[PDB]
């Protein structure tokens, strides 16, 4: 079976599931990387986690386009902030978003 790859590049405002070790795939958003800041590690993106409003930098290997993967990863989970995160990515995906 032929398999479409996930993106190798993202833009500010894109909604994703973001994977970090020890956590389930987590509803998230690609944030702004302001020019006039310290430059990030290469091919890593500033990530905003819905529900907890935590942040981190992650590369595309750990990011999954929200709409395409909502079926697999968008199930309820008891981890703190998770279900509130599911709510935010649908209903208020621009919370604290400074990109535009």
């Amino acid at each position: 079976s032929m398999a479409r790859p996930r993106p190798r590049e993202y833009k500010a405002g894109d909604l994703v599931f973001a994977k970090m070790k020890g956590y389930p795939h987590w509803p998230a958003r690609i944030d702004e990387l302001p020019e006039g800041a310290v430059k990030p590690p290469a091919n890593k993106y500033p990530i905003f986690f819905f529900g907890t409003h935590e942040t981190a930098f992650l590369g595309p290997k750990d990011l999954f386009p929200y709409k395409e993967y909502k079926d697999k990863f968008g199930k309820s989970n008891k981890r703190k902030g998770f279900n509130e995160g599911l709510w935010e990515i649908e209903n208020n995906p621009g919370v604290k978003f400074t990109g535009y």
Partner: peptide, 5 residues
């Protein structure tokens, strides 16, 4: 509101 890990 902080950095994750």
């Amino acid at each position: 509101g902080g950095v994750k890990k």
